[PDB]
Write a protein that binds this ligand. Structure first.
Ligand SMILES: CCC[C@@H](C)[C@H]1CC[C@H]2[C@@H]3[C@H](O)C[C@@H]4C[C@H](O)CC[C@]4(C)[C@H]3C[C@H](O)[C@]12C
Lengths: 140, 570, 98, 107, 123
RNA sequence: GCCACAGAG
DNA sequence: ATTTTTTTGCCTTCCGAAAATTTTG
DNA sequence: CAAAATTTTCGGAAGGCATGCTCTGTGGC
C-alpha cells in the first residue's frame, strides 16, 4: 500500500485519511450532518430504519478519488482496511459486508449522570486529593 | 516526589499495606466494620478466610471472644442477613450449625443509598413530598433492621390516616417486587439446598431399576431441578398479600409476616439502567427514552441477574451448561410479561415526550412512530431488541449482556490507558490469534507504539502471550510470540480491581473519620446541629467542612465505581 | 521366618516386624562378638516401629518420624525442608535437642 | 466379612465404606490359608473397650494422640477388626524380663 | 560480562537505574466534581450509616470512679440503650443455639429512625 | 580469600 | 567449529505409555 | 457387544543424597 514511507508508516497521513473518510461517512449516515447535532441534543433527528443510511465501499472510494488529497491511487482493499481501522477505534460500525455507518458515540466524542461511555466530559481531579481512585493501583 | 522516597514514607503515605489483602475479604470486612462493630468485622473476616465455621470453631479461632460474644454478634449479623447458616446432623447423631457468609447482606449494606434512591425514583412519588419521605423512611428502616413485620412497624405510629397510608405504601412496595417475604430460603445456601434436593430425589428412586446409572442420575437431577425451581420461585408469588378484606374491603399485607428488601429486583433495575446508558450512546435520545419506558415496563418479570442453578456446581457437565443457555434463551422470550408492542408502550409515555419530528422518512404518541423507534432499536448493531413476530418485541438479555460487558470493559481501557489501547484490544479480539506484523498491518500505527501499548495491556490480563517454540528447548529468542485476548481473565481481573478500589476508598474514609472522631462527635449533636457557625471555632468549622466534603466525594466515587463494577457481576 | 523385615511387616504386621528388627540386629552383633545389651536394640526397634509402620533411619524416615523443621534441616536436604516449612506455614515447637 | 478368591477390582475397594453405620471387611482365601495370630513372631493382641481405654489414658495421664500407633489394613488389625480410635494391649515376651504389656492405638 | 549486550531499541544511557515508582499515575474518570443527585445519594449513605451505627445491632469494639460525691446526685443518666435482646426477633430465621442470648420472654420495643430529608452535611 | 593436592591419628 | 573416562550404591518423585476396568451408546 | 472415558500399573529417566571425624603444612590463581 501507499502507507509505507521509508520502510515505516506515516501516521499523519493515516490520521488525515481516516478523518476525511469518517467525515464522508458521517455526512452520508446522518440527515443534516454535524450541524444537526450542533444546535442541541434534543433538536437532532435521525433517519428512518428503512432508509439506506449505510455507505458502501465504492462510494467512499469514488469520494476519495475525487478529493485527490491522498495524491496516490487507492485500491478497494486499502480503503476497506482503513475503514476496518476506523471500526477498530469504534468510530463506525459494519452492518453488512462492504457497508459501514458512523456510530453516535464518535459523534458525541467531538464535542446528567455519570457513565463510562461519556468519560471525556469528566474533569480530572484536583491535586493534593487523598481519596482519588487509580486504575493502575493494586497492581503497581 | 522527584527526590528519593524512604520506605518509611512509602509505607506510611501509600497503600502498600492494603495491596496484600484479598479484595473480597477487604471489602466485606471494611463494610461490616463501617456499619456494624469490630466484633462483627472479625467474625465476617474469619468466615471469609476460613470458609464455613461452627460457633466453637469461631470461638477457638478468634482470640479474646468467648461463646456469648460470638453468639451475640452472630445474632446481630443474622438479623441484617449478613450470615447464612446450615444445621446438619452427623452419622453419630451430633447436630452442628455451620455459619457461612452471604454476599446478599453485604451488597445490601454496599448498595443501601442506591437502593433507597431507586425505590424513590421507580414509583414516581417524587412529585408528592409526603409519600416520598414515607417511602424513604420505610425502606431505610427495612434495610437497617434487615427484616421487619408491618404490625411492629405500625405499633410506633399513632395517626390512623398515617397508618393507612403506610399500609398502602407497603402494599405498593410488595406488589412491584421490591419487598418480599423473608424465609429460611434466604438463609440457606444454594449449594446445600441443591445437594439436599438431589440426594433426596436420588434416594427416592427405588433399587433394582432397569434403567442404568447415568439415567438414574439424570432423572434424579431433573426432579431436583424442578423442585429447586419451585422452591426458589416461592417468594415471588405474592402469597403474603392474599389477605384481602378484613374490614372495609382493602388489600393489606399480613401483620404476621416479616418483609425484607429484595436484592434481585434492585439488580434488575440496575441492569435496566445500564442498558439504558448503553443505548444512549448508539441510538439517539428519544429512542433512548422509548427504550427506558420499554425496559421499565418489563423490568419486574425480567430474568434474574445470575441463575442460581449455575451456582450449584452443576456446570461441570457441558450438557448442563448448554441446557442452562437454552433455558435462559427460552425464558427471555416466551415469558408472558416480557413481550410488548407499540400500543402497550403508548400508554406509559410521559406527556413531555412528543416523538413527532424525531424521524425523517427520506433523504401525539402515535403507534407508528413508536413502532419505528422499536424497529430502529431492533435493527441496530447492538442487539437491543429482537422480533419474534413483526410488531412484537422482547429484550434479548442473554445476547445483550456480553455486548454490554465488552463495551464497558473496552471503554474503561480507552479512558485509562488511552484510545490506542482500545484499538489494540479490539484488533486482537477481532481476529483471534495474531502476530505483531499482522497487528501492524491490520491496525495502522507505529510498531513501537504497538509494542509499548500491548506491553501496557499485558499487565492487566487484557492480552495473553501465546508462545510458539521453534526449538527443542523453549528459548525466547528462537520462539515466536502471538497475542490473544481472553475475555474471562480480563473481566475477572477488572472486577477484582474495582472491588479493591471500593475497599480502599472505604478504608480511607474510615481512617479519616477515626482521626477526626473528636470533631465529628462534637458536631454530631442535636443542639450543635443547625448551630454549627456559633458554637464552633472557625478552625473547627473549616475542618468540619473539609471532612464532610471529603466524605461526600468518597461516597460519590464509590457510587461511580458501583456503576462500573456491577456490570461484571452480571 | 525371614531375615527380611519389610516382608515380615507386610505378612504378619508391625509387632512382628519389631521382633524381626530386634532379632536380626542382635544376631548381627552376636556373630562378631560385639556383646551389646539388647535393651538398646529394643529401643531402636521401638523407635523404628512406633508410628504404625517401619520408617527406617534415613532422611525419608526422619521426614515422617519428626515433625520439627530445624532438626530435619540440619540433617539433610536443608533447602527443600526450609522452603516446604515456609510454604506450608508450619509451626516448629522448640522442644527438641537440636 | 467378604472372602474373595483370586482378586478384587480397585473399583470395589472404594465401595466398601458405602454403608454409614456398617463396615465391610474383605479377605483373600490365600491370605487365610494360615493364621497369622498363631505365628510365633506375632504376640497376643487384645483390643480394649472404651472404659478400659479411658482407664489407661487416665492411668498414664495422656491424650490418645500420644500413644504408639498401629495402622488399619495392618494384618493383625484386620484380623481383630480394629476401627479408628481403638486401643489394643499387646503382651510382649522378652527374654530379658519376661512378659510385659505395651499399648497401641488404631489410626 | 552479562552487562554488555543491549536490545536494538534501547541505548546505553537509558538502562542501569531501575526506578520503579510506587505511586500510580492512571486515574479512573470517576474523580470529577460532585453533582446534586450524587450529593443526595452520598448523604443517604451517611444517614444510613449513622442509623445502623446507633441501632440495636452494633456489637462494638472488643470517669466511673468508685468514689461517691454529692454531685453524683442530681446527675442525669447518659442514655438508656436498647440492647441486643430488645428486638422483636422472628425465631424461625435463627438457629436454635442462638436463642439463649436473645430475649425469649422479655420486654421488646422496635427502634425506628425517621428519615431526614434535609441535608445534615454542612457544606 | 578461593581452589588444588600433600600428609598426621 | 574432529575428538575419552577418570566411584558406587540407594532412594523417591515424576510422567508418558500401555494395560486394566468401568462406563456410555 | 465394543467404543470411549477413567483409573491403575509399569517402565525409564530425573533428581537428590551418601562417598567418615578432626588436625598440620605448601603452592598458584
Ligand atoms: C524382579 C524383582 C522384583 C522385586 C524387586 C519385587 C517383587 C516382589 C516384591 C516384594 C513383594 O512385592 C512383597 C513385599 C511388598 C511390600 O510392599 C514391600 C516389600 C516386598 C518384600 C516386595 C519388595 C519388592 O518390591 C519385590 C521383592
Amino acid at each position: 500500500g501507499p502507507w509505507f514511507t521509508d520502510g515505516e508508516l506515516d501516521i499523519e497521513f493515516i490520521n488525515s485519511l481516516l478523518t476525511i473518510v469518517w467525515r464522508f461517512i458521517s455526512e452520508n449516515t446522518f440527515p443534516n450532518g454535524f450541524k444537526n447535532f450542533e444546535n442541541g441534543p434534543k433538536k437532532n433527528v435521525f433517519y428512518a430504519p428503512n432508509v439506506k443510511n449505510y455507505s458502501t465501499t465504492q462510494e467512499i472510494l469514488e469520494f476519495i478519488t475525487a478529493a485527490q488529497v491522498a495524491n496516490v491511487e487507492l485500491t478497494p482493499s486499502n480503503i476497506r482496511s482503513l475503514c476496518e481501522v476506523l471500526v477498530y477505534d469504534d468510530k463506525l460500525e459494519k452492518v453488512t459486508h462492504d457497508c459501514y455507518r458512523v456510530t453516535l458515540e464518535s459523534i458525541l466524542q467531538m464535542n446528567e449522570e455519570f457513565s463510562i461511555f461519556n468519560y471525556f466530559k469528566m474533569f480530572p481531579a484536583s491535586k493534593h486529593d487523598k481519596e482519588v481512585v487509580y486504575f493502575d493501583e493494586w497492581t503497581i | 516526589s522527584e527526590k528519593l522516597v524512604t520506605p518509611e514514607d512509602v509505607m506510611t503515605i501509600s497503600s502498600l499495606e492494603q495491596r496484600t489483602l484479598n479484595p473480597d475479604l477487604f471489602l466485606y470486612k471494611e463494610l461490616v466494620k463501617a456499619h456494624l462493630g469490630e466484633r462483627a468485622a472479625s467474625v465476617i473476616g474469619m468466615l471469609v478466610a476460613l470458609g464455613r465455621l461452627s460457633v466453637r470453631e469461631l470461638v477457638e479461632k478468634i482470640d479474646g471472644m468467648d461463646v456469648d460474644s460470638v453468639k451475640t454478634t452472630l445474632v446481630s449479623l443474622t438479623q441484617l442477613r449478613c450470615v447464612k447458616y446450615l444445621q446438619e446432623t452427623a452419622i453419630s447423631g451430633k447436630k452442628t450449625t455451620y455459619y457461612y457468609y452471604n454476599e446478599e447482606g453485604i451488597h445490601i449494606l454496599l448498595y443501601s443509598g442506591l437502593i433507597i434512591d431507586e425505590i424513590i425514583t421507580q414509583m414516581r412519588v417524587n412529585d408528592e413530598e409526603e409519600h416520598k419521605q414515607l417511602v424513604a423512611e420505610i425502606v431505610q428502616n427495612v434495610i437497617s433492621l434487615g427484616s421487619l413485620t408491618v404490625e411492629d412497624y405500625l405499633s410506633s405510629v399513632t395517626s390512623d390516616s398515617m397508618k393507612y397510608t403506610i399500609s398502602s405504601l407497603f402494599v405498593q412496595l410488595c406488589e412491584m417486587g421490591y419487598l418480599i417475604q423473608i424465609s429460611k430460603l434466604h438463609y440457606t445456601p444454594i449449594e446445600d439446598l441443591w445437594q439436599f434436593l438431589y440426594e433426596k430425589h436420588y434416594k427416592n428412586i427405588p433399587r433394582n431399576s432397569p434403567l442404568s446409572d447415568l439415567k438414574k442420575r439424570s432423572q434424579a437431577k431433573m426432579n431436583a431441578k424442578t423442585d429447586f425451581a419451585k422452591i426458589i420461585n416461592k417468594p415471588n408469588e405474592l402469597s403474603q398479600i392474599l389477605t384481602v378484606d378484613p374490614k372495609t374491603s382493602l388489600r393489606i399485607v399480613k401483620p404476621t409476616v416479616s418483609l425484607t428488601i429484595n436484592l434481585d429486583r434492585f439488580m434488575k433495575g440496575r441492569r435496566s439502567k445500564q442498558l439504558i446508558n448503553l443505548a444512549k450512546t448508539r441510538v439517539g435520545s428519544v429512542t433512548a427514552q422509548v427504550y427506558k419506558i420499554a425496559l421499565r415496563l418489563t423490568e419486574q418479570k425480567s430474568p434474574k441477574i445470575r441463575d442460581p442453578l449455575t451456582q450449584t456446581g452443576l456446570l461441570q457437565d457441558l450438557e448442563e451448561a448448554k441446557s442452562f443457555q437454552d433455558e435462559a434463551e427460552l425464558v427471555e422470550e416466551k415469558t408472558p410479561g416480557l413481550t410488548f408492542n407499540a400500543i402497550d408502550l403508548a400508554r406509559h409515555l410521559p406527556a413531555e415526550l412528543d416523538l413527532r419530528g424525531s424521524l425523517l422518512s427520506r433523504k401525539p404518541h402515535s403507534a407508528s412512530l413508536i413502532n419505528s423507534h422499536l424497529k430502529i432499536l431492533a435493527s441496530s448493531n447492538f442487539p437491543f431488541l429482537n422480533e419474534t413476530k413483526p410488531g412484537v418485541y422482547y429484550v434479548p438479555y442473554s445476547k445483550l449482556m456480553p455486548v454490554l460487558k465488552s463495551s464497558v470493559y473496552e471503554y474503561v481501557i480507552a479512558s485509562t490507558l488511552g484510545p490506542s489501547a482500545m484499538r489494540l484490544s479490539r484488533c486482537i479480539r477481532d481476529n483471534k490469534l495474531v502476530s505483531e506484523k499482522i497487528i501492524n498491518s491490520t491496525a495502522l500505527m507505529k510498531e513501537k507504539d504497538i509494542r509499548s501499548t500491548l506491553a501496557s495491556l499485558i499487565r492487566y490480563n487484557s492480552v495473553e502471550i501465546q508462545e510458539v517454540p521453534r526449538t527443542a528447548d523453549r528459548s525466547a529468542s528462537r520462539a515466536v510470540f502471538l497475542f490473544r485476548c481472553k475475555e474471562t481473565h480480563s473481566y475477572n481481573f477488572m472486577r477484582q480491581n474495582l472491588e479493591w478500589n471500593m475497599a480502599n476508598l472505604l478504608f480511607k474514609k474510615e481512617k479519616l473519620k477515626q482521626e477526626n472522631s473528636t470533631l465529628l462527635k462534637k458536631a454530631n449533636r442535636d443542639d450543635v446541629k443547625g448551630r454549627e457557625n456559633e458554637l464552633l471555632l472557625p478552625s473547627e468549622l473549616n475542618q468540619l467542612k473539609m471532612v464532610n466534603e471529603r466524605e461526600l466525594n468518597v461516597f460519590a466515587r464509590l457510587s461511580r465505581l458501583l456503576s462500573l463494577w456491577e456490570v461484571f457481576q452480571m | 521366618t525371614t531375615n527380611h523385615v519389610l516382608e515380615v511387616f507386610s505378612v504378619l504386621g508391625i509387632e512382628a516386624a519389631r521382633y524381626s528388627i530386634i532379632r536380626e540386629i542382635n544376631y548381627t552383633m552376636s556373630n562378631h562378638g560385639m556383646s551389646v545389651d539388647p535393651r538398646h536394640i529394643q529401643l531402636l526397634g521401638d523407635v523404628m516401629t512406633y508410628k504404625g509402620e517401619v520408617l527406617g533411619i534415613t532422611r525419608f524416615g526422619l521426614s515422617k518420624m519428626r515433625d520439627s523443621v530445624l532438626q530435619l534441616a540440619s540433617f539433610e536436604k536443608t533447602t527443600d525442608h526450609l522452603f516446604d516449612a515456609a510454604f506450608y506455614m508450619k509451626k516448629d515447637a522448640v522442644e527438641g535437642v537440636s | 466379612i467378604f472372602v474373595y478368591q483370586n482378586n478384587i477390582t480397585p473399583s470395589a475397594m472404594k465401595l466398601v465404606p458405602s454403608i454409614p453405620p456398617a463396615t465391610i471387611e474383605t479377605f483373600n482365601e490365600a491370605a487365610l490359608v494360615v493364621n497369622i495370630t498363631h505365628h510365633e513372631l506375632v504376640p497376643k493382641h487384645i483390643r480394649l473397650s472404651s472404659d478400659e481405654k479411658r482407664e489407661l489414658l487416665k492411668r498414664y495421664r495422656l491424650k490418645e494422640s500420644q500413644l504408639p500407633r498401629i495402622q488399619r489394613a495392618d494384618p493383625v488389625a484386620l484380623y481383630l477388626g480394629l476401627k479408628r480410635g481403638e486401643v489394643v494391649k499387646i503382651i510382649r515376651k522378652s527374654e530379658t524380663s519376661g512378659r510385659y504389656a505395651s499399648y497401641r492405638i488404631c489410626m | 560480562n552479562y552487562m554488555s549486550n543491549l536490545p536494538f531499541g534501547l541505548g546505553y544511557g537509558d538502562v542501569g537505574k531501575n526506578h520503579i515508582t510506587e505511586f500510580p499515575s492512571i486515574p479512573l474518570p470517576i474523580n470529577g466534581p460532585i453533582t446534586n443527585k450524587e450529593r443526595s445519594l452520598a448523604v443517604k449513605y451517611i444517614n444510613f450509616g449513622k442509623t445502623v451505627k446507633d441501632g440495636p445491632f452494633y456489637t462494638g469494639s472488643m470517669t466511673n470512679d468508685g468514689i461517691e460525691r454529692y454531685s453524683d446526685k442530681y446527675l442525669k443518666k447518659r442514655k438508656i440503650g436498647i440492647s441486643i435482646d430488645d428486638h422483636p426477633y422472628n425465631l424461625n430465621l435463627f438457629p436454635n443455639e442462638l436463642y439463649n442470648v436473645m430475649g425469649i420472654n422479655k420486654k421488646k420495643l422496635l427502634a425506628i429512625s425517621k428519615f431526614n430529608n434535609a441535608d445534615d452535611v454542612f457544606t
